[PDB]
Each structure stands twice: as C-alpha cells, then as structure tokens.
Amino acid sequence: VSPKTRTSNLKNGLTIASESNPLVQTATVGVWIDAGSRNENAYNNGTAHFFEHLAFKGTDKRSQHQLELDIENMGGHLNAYTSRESTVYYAKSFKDDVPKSVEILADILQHSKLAESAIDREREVITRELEEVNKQYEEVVFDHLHATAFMNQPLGRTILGPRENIQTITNTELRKFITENYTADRMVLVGAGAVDHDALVELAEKYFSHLPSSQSPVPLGTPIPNFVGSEVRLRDDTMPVAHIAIAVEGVSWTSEDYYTALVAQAIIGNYDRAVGTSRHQGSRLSNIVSENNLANSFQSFSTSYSDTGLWGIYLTSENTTQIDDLVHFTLKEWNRLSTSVSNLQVERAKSQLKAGLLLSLDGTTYVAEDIGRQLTTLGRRVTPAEVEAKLEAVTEHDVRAWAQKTLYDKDIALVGLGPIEGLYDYNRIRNDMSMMRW
Amino acid sequence: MALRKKNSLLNMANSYVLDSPQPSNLNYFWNFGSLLALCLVIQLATGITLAMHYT
Amino acid sequence: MALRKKNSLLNMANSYVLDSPQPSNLNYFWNFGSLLALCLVIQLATGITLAMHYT
Amino acid sequence: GKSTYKIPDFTPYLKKDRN
Amino acid sequence: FSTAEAAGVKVAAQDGQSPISDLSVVLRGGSRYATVPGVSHILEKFAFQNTVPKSALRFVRELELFGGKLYTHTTREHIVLRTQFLKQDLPYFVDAFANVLKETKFQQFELTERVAPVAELDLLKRESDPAFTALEAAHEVAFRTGLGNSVYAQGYSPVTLEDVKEFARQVYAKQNVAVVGNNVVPADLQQLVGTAFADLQEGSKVTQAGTTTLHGGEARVRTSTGNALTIALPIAEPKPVYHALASFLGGPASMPWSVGASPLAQATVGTHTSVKATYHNYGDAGLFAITIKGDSPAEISQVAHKAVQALKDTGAEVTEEQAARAYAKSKFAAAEAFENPDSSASVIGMELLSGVSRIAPENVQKFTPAELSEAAAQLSASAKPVVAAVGQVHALPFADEL
Amino acid sequence: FSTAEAAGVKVAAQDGQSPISDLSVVLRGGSRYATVPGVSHILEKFAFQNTVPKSALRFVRELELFGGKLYTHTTREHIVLRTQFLKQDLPYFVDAFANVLKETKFQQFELTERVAPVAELDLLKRESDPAFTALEAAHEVAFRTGLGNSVYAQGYSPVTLEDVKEFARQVYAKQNVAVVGNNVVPADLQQLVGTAFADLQEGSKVTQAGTTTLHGGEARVRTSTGNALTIALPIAEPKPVYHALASFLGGPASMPWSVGASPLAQATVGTHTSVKATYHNYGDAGLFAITIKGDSPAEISQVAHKAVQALKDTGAEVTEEQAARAYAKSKFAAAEAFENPDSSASVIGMELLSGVSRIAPENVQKFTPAELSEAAAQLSASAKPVVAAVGQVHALPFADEL
Amino acid sequence: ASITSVVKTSELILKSPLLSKIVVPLAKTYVKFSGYRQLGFKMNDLIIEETPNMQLALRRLPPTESYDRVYRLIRATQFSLSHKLATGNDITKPEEDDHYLIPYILDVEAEAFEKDALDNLEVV
Ligand code: HEM
Ligand code: HEM
Ligand SMILES: CCCCCCCCCCCCO[C@@H]1O[C@H](CO)[C@@H](O[C@H]2O[C@H](CO)[C@@H](O)[C@H](O)[C@H]2O)[C@H](O)[C@H]1O
Ligand SMILES: CCCCCCCCCCCCO[C@@H]1O[C@H](CO)[C@@H](O[C@H]2O[C@H](CO)[C@@H](O)[C@H](O)[C@H]2O)[C@H](O)[C@H]1O
Fold it and tell me: How many domains, in total, are found in chain F?
C-alpha cells in the first residue's frame, strides 16, 4: 500500500498534489500543464515547443547565465517536454533544495524575458532540429501516423511546427500563447519523494499566487477528431530496417473502454529479439514472429488523448522479403480479439497488467509523472485499489465486444518507413482486418 | 509464413493470380487475356456438353 | 549460366527430368511411376486413334 | 513540396461521415 | 538496508510502503574475476535458462502471470540479477534465484542458439554509442588485465561451454552471493533465503588473477559509426575527492537546450560535442575519465585541448562558490544512484560482498577549494595518461599532443 | 644504367643481351605524398584503365598479341608501373605509358566497378599474412602521417573520384616521373621518350605535407587470422650501417629445414616461429624492425624476449667473424635487390627522382665490429620503441615488457 | 508417434520385472531380425527426420557425432544400391549401437510439449 496522494487548491485554482516517500532523499517538483501543441492554430503551430526553448533563456531577474548557475548550485537538474496535449516542467533536487527549485520554476513560467535577440538565436537551433529528428525513426513514424490519422486536424499537427512558422514566430505570439494557455486552472504543481505537502502548498502561495486565471474554468482534462483511414509510405531502400506502424482510432482517457483497450493491447504485447526472455512469451504473435524471424521487435501501444486515441502496433524488421507475412500475422492476431479470445488470454493479460500499472512507478520522477498525468487527464489520482477493481471488471466478453466495435473490419492508419517494397497496398492490408471464415 | 506462399501447389496459383506483381497502370486493353480465358472455358463447357449429344 | 537453367520453360523440364536430384539407391520398384506415364501416353495415343473410328 | 508531415489535399474526396 | 546473514548468505533488505519489490542477487563475478574474456557476460546471459526444476520457458510464462520483470547486467565487479514484482510474490522469486544458483543445466544448445546471440546483440547495441567504446578501450589500456578485461563477450574470443561451466562453479557459491531486497520485509527475506539457499555450495571467494597494475598508452579503434575520445587517468590511490572533482568538472547540462556552467561544458561552446567527466572507484585502483563525443573529429580535437586545459586550470585554483557547487552536485549524484534500483543493488552489493561500508548521500564529504585543486593537480601531472580515440582516428588527438 | 634526360623526363637505361625488356615508369606518388589515405594505391590501380586514345580493353587485347605483361605496385615512396615485353616492341610500350600519364579518363564507373574492388582484393590478400599487418601497423605508430599513412586503400576511409583526379594532376607530371629501361638500348629509349612525353605537364615536385616526426607506442590489431609481433625502432638519422645490422641479426635460414646461424634465427629454437630483421631507409627517417610470426602467442612472447636480448647482446660485442658474415650477407642482399625487376626499378627511380646515388653492390661498405656494436647500442637504447601486435593481442607482449 | 511417447512407454515396461522378463528378449531378437546393423546403421539413424522438431535436434548434435552420422548414411546408401551388406568393421556391433540422438530429441520435444501445455493454461 502506497502513501496517500494529498491534493490542495489555491485561490487562483492551481492544484497542488504531492506523494511523499520518507525512504528517499531526492524530490521531483514540477508543473504539469493541460496545454500543448493542440492548443495552437495553423499559423502559430510550433509556439509551444518554441517557448520550451526560451523558458530557459532568462527571466526578468536572472539572466541566462545566472539561471544556469542557480540550477548548478542547487545540485539537481531541470527538464521540460511539450507533447500534443501536455507540457511538463520539472526539477529533480535534494530534499532541502525544494524551495529553490519551486522558485526557479515559478520564475521561468511567469517571468520569462522572451527577448527578440533570443527568439532570433533559437530560431536557428530549432530549424536545425527539423533536420535531425529524421534519425529517430520511431518518432518519425509516429509523427507521420498522427499526421495521417488526424488529417488536417489539430491532433495531426507536429509539435515542432513547419519551417515557415519557425521563421515567423514573434515574442508577441509567444506571450499571447502562454497567457491564454498557461493558466492556474490548467496547471498542477506536483511533488513526489522527499516533500512535505504543507511545505509545498506554502511555496505555491508564495510563488504561483499571481498566475492568470482563465475566463471559463473548465475541469482538468476537458477536451472534434475524425480519424482518416490512410497510409503514408516513406520508402527508403538504403535503410536496412523497415519500420511500420498500424493504428486504429482508440480510446480517450475517460472512455468506459480505457481498461478494456489496455487488456486488449496486453494480449498482443511486445517482443524484442534482443531480450532473452522474449522467445518464451505467451503472446501468440510473439510466438509466430520469433519462430519465423519475422521481426526484430514489435510494441503494441494504446495512446489516449482527451477526446480520442490511437491503438495499434509498431513493428521493426530486417526481413524485407517477409514483411507481408509479418503484417498478415499481426492483423490476424487482432482478428482473434474479435473472434476467439476467451478467459484464458483475458485472465493472463489482466494478471500482467495488475502489476504492470504499478511497476512503471519506480523513482520519484515516474511517480510525479503519474500524479501529473492523471491529474491533468482525469482530474484526480486514481488509487491502486480502484485501478485493480477496474481491471477486474474487464471480462472476455468485454474484450470481444470492444474489439468487434473498434478493430474488426475498421479502417487503419498505416505508416511504413524504410525498405517497405514488400508491404502490400492499402486494400490488401485493410482486408486482413476481417476474416472471411468468421 | 502464410499458407498461400508455403504450400507448393497453392504457391503456384498465388504467383499467377493473387500476389502476381502487375504494373499499376494497365488499361482496359489488358483485359482481353482474361476474356480469352473465359472464352476458352465457355468453349470447353459447351463443347463437352455438345459432345454428349453429337454423333 | 546454362540455357537449361536460364530459360524459364526449359528450366521446368530440367527440374523434373534432368537435373532433378534423386536418391542414389532407388530400386526397381521406383520404376512404376515412369511405366504409368508410358501407359498414360499409350492410352492417349491409342484412345484418340480409336475415337477417330468409333461412333 | 518539401514537408512530408503536411499531408497533400484530399478534401475533394474525403467523406465527412467516413467512420 | 538492514544487513544480516541467512544460511551463510549475506542478505540486506529495506522495508518500504509500495506494492512493488525489487529482489537482486549480486554476484562477485564481474569481468575482473573472469578466467576467460567475456565469461561473466555469458554467465549473466545464462541466468534464468533451463534449470533442473524449471525450464526457461516455464519460468518466463509464470513470471508473466505474476507480472514480474527480470533485469540482468554485468559490471567489472559484479553480475547483478534483479527481479521486480509485487510484494506478495516474494517466495516465488527467492526460490527462482535458488534454482538458478543451484541447478542451472548449462546446455550447449542454449549457449549456441540462445545465450551467445543475445550477448552479441547486447554488445552491438552498446557499441552504437562511440563514447561507450572509447571508455571501454580506455580501461583496457589502463589496466591490461583484471579491470582491463572486456566486460562483454566478443566474437574474436569465443567462450566455450566448459569455460562458462567452470566459472559458474566458482561464482555460484555462498561466498560470492549477496541478496539485496528493496521494499522487502527484512525478517521475511531472511527466513526465505535461509531455507532456499541452504544447499548452495560454500565455495571460496573469487579473486582477481594477478594484482592491479596501472599503465598509460593509447587505443585507436577505427569505426565508421561516429567519433569519440576518452582522456583517462588511472588512479593508484582511489580517494572520495575524485567524485567531487568529477561532478565539479561536470560536462552534461542541468537544464534543456543549454550548455551548462561546468568548466567542461563551457569547453564545448560553438561545437555539437558533448563531454562527461566520470570517476570509477574499483577498490584498489580508480579511473578518472573525460569522454568527448561528436560528429566532427576537428571539433573533438579542439574540445580535447580545452578539456585538458580546464583540468590544469582547476589544479591552479577553485573558488569557494565552485567548491560548494561541487558538494551539491556530488551529494545529488550519490542520492540518485542509491535510488535507481540498478545501481542501488550494486552499492549495497559492494558493502555486503567486499565490506566497503556504503557512503550514504547525507554523509558525502564537503571538500575545501584546497583539497579539490590538489586532486586536480595530481591528475594533470600523471605519468600514465591514457587516450582512447574511436572513429576517424587519423584525425583525432594523440596522448603526446595533450 | 646510363642516366640521361629526354624532354624534361629523367631516363635511365642499361642495354643487355636478352630478348626481354623491362620498361618501368617510376612516379613520385607513393603513400607519403598521398593527399588522402589510400589514394596512391587507387592511382596505381587506375593505371592502364581507359585513356582517350585507347580503351583498357583494347590495351589488354593488344598487349596479349605482343605477349607483354604488366605489373604495378605502390610503396611509401613510389608508384611503379612495369611492363615486360620483347625487345622489339619497345615503341608500343613507350606510347602506352605516355597515354596513361597524359590521357587517363578517370571515370566514376571504373572506380566503383573495376579499380576499388581490385584494390580491396589486393589488400585482403596481403593481410592474409599477419606479419604484413604488423609491419604496416608499426609504420603507422612510428610516423603517424607521411610515412605513417597507409599504403593500401582501406574500406573504412573511402577514396573518391575527385581525390584520385586531384592527386593524379600532381603526380602525372614531368617533375615526378622517371623512366627506367632494363635491357633497352639507351639511345633508342631517349629518342622515344623524347617524342612521347613531350606534351606531359611540367607540374611541380610533389611534397610531403608536414615534416617527418618520430613517435613510439603500441598498436594492437585484434585479428583471428594468425599472430605476429613487430618490434620497430624509428631512426632519426638513417645510416648504411643499419643494413649491415639487419643482415647480421638476420632471422631467415640460408638452408632448407634448418634454423640458421643468425642470432635472431637461434632465438626461434624449439618454436614454430619465424623472425626477420628489416631496415627501411626513407631518406629523412628510417625504421629498423624485427617481426615475429607464429601460431602460438606464448611462443611469440618467448621469442620476443630473446629477440630484444639478441639486440642488446649485439650492442655489447660483435666478433670479427660476425662482422665479416654481416658484410657478406649484406653485399648479397644488395645484389639480389638490384637484380629483381620490381626493386631494381625503384632503386634507380630513387636515384633519378631524388639525387641519392645508388649504392652498387660492389661498393657496399664493410663495417668493423666496433661500428656494428655501436649501431646496435643506439637501437637498444631508443627512447621511442614501437610494438605492433596482431592476432590474440591479449596474449602478446607490450612495449614496457620488452 | 513422438519419441517421448516411445521412451516413456519403454520405461514403464523396463520397470515392471514381469514385463521386462518377457519383452527384453523379444526386443533383442526383433532388432537382430530387423537387420539394420548389417548396413552399419545405429538404431537412431533410422528415425524420420523431416519434421521441424527432428531438424532442430539434428542441428544440436555435436559436430563429430554429426559428421559420423553423415558417413553412416552415405555408406548405407552405397550398400543399398550395390545390394551388398556390411562386412567386418562396417557391421554395427551391439555395443556400438548407442542412442546418440535420443537425448537431443527428447529435449526439443520436452520444450515443444511444454509450450503446448502452457498455451492452454487457465489462471485459477
Ligand atoms: C477453342 C475451343 C473451341 C472452339 C474455338 C470451337 C469452335 C467450334 C465451332 C466454330 C463449331 C461449329 C459451330 C456451329 O456452327 O454449330 C464447333 C462445333 C462443335 N464443337 Fe467446338 N470449339 C471448341 C471447343 C470444343 C470442345 C472442347 C469440344 C469438346 C468436344 C467441342 C465440341 C464441338 C462439337 C461437338 C461441335 C459440333 C456440334 C455443333 O456444331 O454445335 N468444341 N466448335
Ligand atoms: C487412362 C486412359 C484410358 C483408359 C484406362 C482407357 C480404358 C479403356 C477401356 C478399358 C476401354 C474398353 C476397351 C475394350 O474392351 O474394347 C476403352 C475403350 C475406348 N477408349 Fe479408352 N481409355 C483411356 C483413354 C482413352 C482416351 C484418351 C480416349 C480418347 C478418346 C479413349 C477412347 C476410347 C474409345 C473410343 C474406346 C472404345 C473403342 C474400344 O472399345 O476400343 N480412351 N478405353
Ligand atoms: C493462370 C492460371 C492459374 C494457374 C497458375 C499457373 C500454373 C502453373 C504455374 C507454375 C509454373 C511455375 O511458376 C513459377 O512458380 C514459382 C512459385 O509458384 C514462382 O516464383 C515466384 O513466387 C515465389 C513466391 O510466390 C517466390 O519464391 C519467387 O521468388 C518468385 O519468382 C515463379 O515466378 C513462377 O514462374
Ligand atoms: C514431368 C514432365 C516434364 C515437364 C516438367 C513438369 C512440369 C512441372 C513444372 C511446373 C512446376 C514448377 O516447377 C518448379 O520450378 C522450379 C524451376 O523450374 C524448380 O526450382 C528448382 O530448380 C531451380 C533450378 O533448376 C532452382 O533455382 C531452385 O532452387 C529449385 O527449387 C522447382 O523445384 C519446381 O517445383
């Protein structure tokens, strides 16, 4: 039994959420914001990521250099990331260095200079990042996957934004974005590890009290996405490994089917030829793939957003003459979620998940990420007891029902990168989304 | 590996009528080959039937 | 590369009747396959001939 | 003409109620 | 972590308030104790293969029903086998470790088909990073044997089933095993290890064949897969001050999209190069390393000069501010190491096996500017500098240039 | 060999009484002059490719009608292109050389499909001998650049068509070309070279980028294909005494199924190892090497100790008998070198391209025991010893052990 | 049939004193009349190998055992085609008829059968 996550609000509507662990000596405090790239329009796409680069480029008090020094003198580090729906800024420190770190985070969020000179300098750094993501193949694949699945919609946009916008982002647009979006009712100050809740609340009252409140305060994790079955092929014969993602429209955080989709994902599961145990996994797809050397790896995923999701699999393979078999066998394994799954597979996957959802939470950063994610998507921390009950409620009948509505004979978004000559056209892939024998 | 590719007999059908790689831009004049196959089948079926009645 | 292996049509005959790798110890009972082929040929030749005279 | 994340225009053919 | 003893096996456990436990068996079986190059890597990869009571297959399928995970690694000092599971499943995992230590059938087919191929993929993945290669090469030059043995199995020196079986006969013994339990009730672990590991051989303490000798030199590994350069200084008397010095010199940035305020970080300005100072204590000898990776050999060379200069400048004077910055960065490094389960296990493992009482993060010594400058002075003026270059080696610096 | 000049090209010819003539073009284009690593090897392999007047195909088919043969090689100092034909066919071969120097179309497909693959097979065949690798590695350590550049094109550092074209623009010029004619009428060669090489660029003398610097060190080339060990000593002042010393120390047997009477030969007794002392003069620096190959790394190590001892013992005292034995072995080595067409060409090539008069075998100096012992003393007391180990490198000696 | 089945059933028979008393002499005569030893084969050389399991067991044979098996098959095939029998040292003596392959195939099959069982497990 984990210690209780305490939650308080301020007057502006900032949530403070903390989970203390008197066994560790380090703390992670940070701010989780319910805002990300999805909050931009087409003209200011890239702003949120731009701001992340400038948040560390100096404030009204501390210059860029002073900032660097202040953090170095703390001992820990700061980190930030921007996603489609979420922005995180956190500081890992020592137990008694928490007041410094909260003060620095409050400073970089509220009181950033955003000086024209620095905007101009980062505009080159970010421009170079456009031509170096190209190497991170999984990320390239997933970025195209969102672009095609949510064609011409806000979720379909990249985080970095187009080259054109990077050249035209001004301090004015940056200021406007963080004033409209980084509001107190959309922010959660999270502390995990060696933090006292009451101490953290006092620090919030001291530093985050003059945060803007939004005009219309909706609850945390409040959202219209129209999935497009489609494919992007980025053939590159010079690459040795093919990277393929297949996805269907999945489930939102607050779907009734959220846990059902996780169990279904666990029935297929993950595989990696480099891991010793992977040849012995119970998953049927794992067995087919390992026996036939069809793939180096596959990773099932179920990404959620506030109002939609993507559920699918990411495969990598050097076996370029049997990509057809890899895709064929994968989709026939999905078919069986509709036609064949019994309590056998369902109870096995529930067992694996009941632990997996707790095992993820190792160190203070993972705990803080869990509190922050849940508070900004569901509006509360879900206790392990509730999670265990929701998983227990998933029956074989629920999985079959869900798969038959979500996977069976549905349109897919498909992205292939690399030597994918052997990947058949869209129709033949999509035809494997059903079985004529059933 | 899929049965249609694994099994030698199935694989021959597969290579000719199913996975056979074709240019993507054949026009309607590439359809006479299959019509000639259809004519040949109709002539065999009708022909064998007439042979059952002809002296 | 030799023509019998290069040319697709020749290669099919080659793979069945010429380069086909056989066990080196087949005894005389492995000869009925070719006799059955010979019977089938004799029956086709004689059969078609009788059909030219039969009513 | 350069970015591969800018999906070409398919609006002439996309059905609104496709799902 | 309450250290105790259960049937001649040293057991250290710390109870906590979480649903997830980490049980780790730490073996005195790292590469410095290896008999044949690569055997400790192979022995690590042969854990949780077929035992007499339970096949690899059965183990994996049952571990999936408990939703446990299994993690193994080899260092120069230890083999670490760690399982992560729910608190209540402790007895299962204790018994599984016992089967591995007592009853592993080391079968030749497992070596050929399972263990060796996985060990080869492990190494290829690590070598994708040229900095890894450079720091490995540096240890090889500095120590030759013992600490200088490779940690990972290479294809050029094939490990045989007889090699692995022999080594395992020495390693898998009460004298070379420590059990470390994170979020495990200490009383309950002692009782279980006491029943399960009672029939394990006593054996003897594994020792390093030959004493640790330090040497200087160069290694020049021609790869086509990126460029790196390590500047190592072997240390004859390992002292805790070198931790402080490594953290002071620093190198990595402590905030995104920044360079950093550390002397080594400031050496990279205007280059797409990264730098990292590291200190490795191995009890009887140490290694202080500065590794530089980058895509440009010209930039690496440029940084390498600045890096050595930084160390010399440190030997001259450090300010009071800088010495306090070093204390802070070092306390933090110690804390996060004791938190990460991977490193945690090996830290208490060293306390249990060797007897080096652990330095708690709250007890990390504050070094004056005098003590730090003196340590850096002793490094700039070492008679045995090592330089390992990886990549376009014709374009990277040499020892006598630095 | 009567040295003369024909249209700005230095021509040396010696008429003889044989039906077989050897014409060699010696180019100042060896690896020490290489702009980029491997370019001189590629330029050598690009000789007798397509020229504008005559395709590679037509050349080969016509050379077969004359029954001529073509031989090319690259050293650190020269590229040598040699043709062997019947006396009467001289004009054809002169004109062919002229086409190669004036009119080679360096086409990218020839580089990709013809020249690079052949250069790669050339090197793989040489590396089959681990002694070759060891002596190559030793030059790399000793000199770094210039003489330290690789002679052969390696896969890790690719030569581009622009690299080869640039180098050829420098090399194929009147200033870097010498024509050497064995069993060629000297008057007739001058007349032909005078007409054929008149339109060749004058160009300028190719020079080594940077001065020759000597360094000590170690190289440890881990292979699976045999074991060897070179113990090299870079020489700052190349002197002719080192020839005598190399022949004295010897190593190869002068008799079948024997060990030999040379100190280094006597170091191999009871081992299936061979040993070979060599001295390489390169004008401005020299390299004295002792290479040991064998199948056993243990035996190699054992011999290596005896080998260094032998050198030290020589530094102590040489007998009069031993000094005379050295003179005899050295005169002979000089004679047979001037006979072998490959080495002959390069010897007069050096005389023509530099100005270093050849030492005729009849003029080889007799060194007293005093002079020989003094030279061996300088080598035993070198501040910069190089050791290159190839094979099971973990089992071979290190510099500080020797 | 599976080799596992054959081996288990044989062990049941060898356990029972009565059964072994009557079966072991019969099995010895059977093997003598079978006459595979007269072509210089060991019993295990005759087991059907065109199955994934058996292919895997053969790949796991020690190199020497494998090379020897190839020679016995080639030698027997030559006796077969010549209609000769082995003579002298080519005849397999009862002491040379060792079950070199049985351990390998039993391991391959053990895993394959465990895999089938575990594919049908039900969490209770
Ligand atoms: C390419 C295939 C064939 C073609 C092009 C073909 C063509 C013809 C033609 C042109 C006639 C004269 C039709 C008439 O005016 O009545 C005919 C008659 C006939 N064919 Fe075929 N035929 C074919 C295949 C066959 C086959 C396989 C049989 C099998 C026995 C067959 C049996 C007959 C018979 C019995 C008649 C005469 C009865 C009649 O005239 O209808 N045919 N065929
Ligand atoms: C496997 C091939 C064949 C078998 C086993 C077979 C068998 C027979 C048999 C048993 C008879 C009765 C013979 C008698 O007692 O007179 C017969 C008659 C006949 N068969 Fe076939 N036959 C074959 C192929 C053919 C073919 C291809 C034709 C082509 C038309 C053909 C045409 C005839 C005719 C016209 C007769 C009747 C005239 C007669 O009895 O001789 N047969 N066949
Ligand atoms: C159109 C009538 C329908 C019946 C089909 C025709 C029946 C007779 C066809 C068989 C003749 C041999 O046909 C030959 O077979 C093999 C496998 O089947 C094919 O082989 C092809 O496909 C297989 C996999 O699908 C690949 O291993 C191979 O690289 C490729 O070339 C040949 O391209 C084809 O030429
Ligand atoms: C029996 C009468 C004689 C006519 C031939 C019989 C017609 C049947 C042939 C049609 C079926 C296709 O036959 C198929 O073809 C290819 C090449 O031809 C063969 O392929 C085989 O031979 C070729 C070279 O000879 C190799 O490249 C290949 O590795 C090997 O498998 C197949 O083993 C065979 O199954």
Answer: 2
